[PDB]
Amino acid sequence: EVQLVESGGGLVQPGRSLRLPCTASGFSFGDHAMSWVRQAPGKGLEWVGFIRKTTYGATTHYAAAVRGRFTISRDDSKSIVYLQMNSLKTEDTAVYFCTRVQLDYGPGYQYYGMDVWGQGTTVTVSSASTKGPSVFPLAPSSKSTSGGTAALGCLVKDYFPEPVTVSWNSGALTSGVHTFPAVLQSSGLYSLSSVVTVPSSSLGTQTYICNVNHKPSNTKVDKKVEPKSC
Amino acid sequence: ESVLTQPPSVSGAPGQRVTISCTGMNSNIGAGYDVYWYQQLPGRAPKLLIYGNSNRPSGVPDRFSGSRSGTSASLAITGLQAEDEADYYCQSYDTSLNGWAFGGGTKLTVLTQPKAAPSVTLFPPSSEELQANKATLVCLVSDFYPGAVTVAWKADGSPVKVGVETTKPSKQSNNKYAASSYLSLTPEQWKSHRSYSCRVTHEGSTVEKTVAPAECS
Numbered sequence A: 001e002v003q004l005v006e007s008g009g010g011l012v013q014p015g016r017s018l019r020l021p022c023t024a025s026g027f028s029f030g031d032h033a034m035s036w037v038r039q040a041p042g043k044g045l046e047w048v049g050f051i052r053k054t055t056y057g058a059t060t061h062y063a064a065a066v067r068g069r070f071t072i073s074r075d076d077s078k079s080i081v082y083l084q085m086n087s088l089k090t091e092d093t094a095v096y097f098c099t100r101v102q103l104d105y106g107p108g109y110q111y112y113g114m115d116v117w118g119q120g121t122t123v124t125v126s127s128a129s130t131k132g133p134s135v136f137p138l139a140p141s142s143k144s145t146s147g148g149t150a151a152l153g154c155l156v157k158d159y160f161p162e163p164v165t166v167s168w169n170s171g172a173l174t175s176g177v178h179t180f181p182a183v184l185q186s187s188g189l190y191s192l193s194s195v196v197t198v199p200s201s202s203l204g205t206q207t208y209i210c211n212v213n214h215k216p217s218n219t220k221v222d223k224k225v226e227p228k229s230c
Numbered sequence B: 001e002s003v004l005t006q007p008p009s010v011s012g013a014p015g016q017r018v019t020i021s022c023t024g025m026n027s028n029i030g031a032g033y034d035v036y037w038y039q040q041l042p043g044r045a046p047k048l049l050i051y052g053n054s055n056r057p058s059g060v061p062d063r064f065s066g067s068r069s070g071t072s073a074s075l076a077i078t079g080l081q082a083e084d085e086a087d088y089y090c091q092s093y094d095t096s097l098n099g100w101a102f103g104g105g106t107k108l109t110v111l112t113q114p115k116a117a118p119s120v121t122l123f124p125p126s127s128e129e130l131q132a133n134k135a136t137l138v139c140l141v142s143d144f145y146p147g148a149v150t151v152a153w154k155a156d157g158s159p160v161k162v163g164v165e166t167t168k169p170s171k172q173s174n175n176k177y178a179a180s181s182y183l184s185l186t187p188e189q190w191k192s193h194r195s196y197s198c199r200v201t202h203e204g205s206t207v208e209k210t211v212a213p214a215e216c217s
């Protein structure tokens, strides 16, 4: 079957460079233009650039955001197309997909839909390294209490890499708990929150502790979440 | 996106017909550039769905149809099936960008449970974080269906876009969805305003919660 396989992902510092090879199989690589597309974590698709067949000079065309920084090239004898990324910026962080441009003929011209996609490879541009989280309480108050139910939680900030797990009262409190996925800040560090809803009457009588584990930094944090009388 | 505009979400029950619009410009669809559609199933790479405005690749069933008229394109799904839950992206060439442009993407939900409006809780910076010279507002959204919201922030009634981070919705234990959004501020920014608000839009309706820096400090 037709197949594309990217390699070469990884973590690289801003201002450095990385090459991604993409190997094609199951079709005649040289018969097709090839196109790169990227998808930053949580975001939509964004075209990177494409390269024509060698018989036409293998000319290339890029999105404005990577012009003068990224270079696409191809080697038809090895069925490989390369994405050379120079001058990397944090906002280049994305999954990079290698794609094949179709040959289907329309009314007087060829279409250019991307009809085969690789699985994609992650490129992270960041100066972050292993870092344990800071844990802050999200104290319950009148502003988080509705109809006799109070929400409280804990904010787990600026850690690397994923993941952290959160439990409440050592696993004894599970009803109403939700731990959210993390957000990636531009600094390259992650943050998340965990929330639980409890009866507002229990607040003076029950203790609530969120247990944060970040195994990459060998850190555990048990944060007491005290209610605010406002 | 800028030059191609899609609705962030669309939904319907199994068997229904839904449409996804792709509103273009005279620098792309209106100038005659063809429209392409890509389907991205959750956790997968995109696949070509429609090429050259209305053509289906082999392997794409005929409940998918594409049309174009003027500066607009549209993807119809006639007879929604469960496996069609996916993000859909339209794509066209744009001469003001001189590149291949994508719409922002539409999440299609195939409804399997009753719709449910979101609950919203907004947390101010904790004193502990403030004492560490940082400030994060935390807006938590829960118990909603389908799993698509938009979150906007305000300071003193005025929009604020810098410093915002939002997660894509994910399932809670009760099978509804939750989402979170964060506003990062300096302690001085926080203290300098009278109010901060998060506004959560779900199915064209909006829930807004407000905190005041002068309270709970």
Ligand code: NA
Pocket (backbone or CB within 6 Å): A032, A033, A051, A052, A053, A056
């Ligand atoms: Na070509």
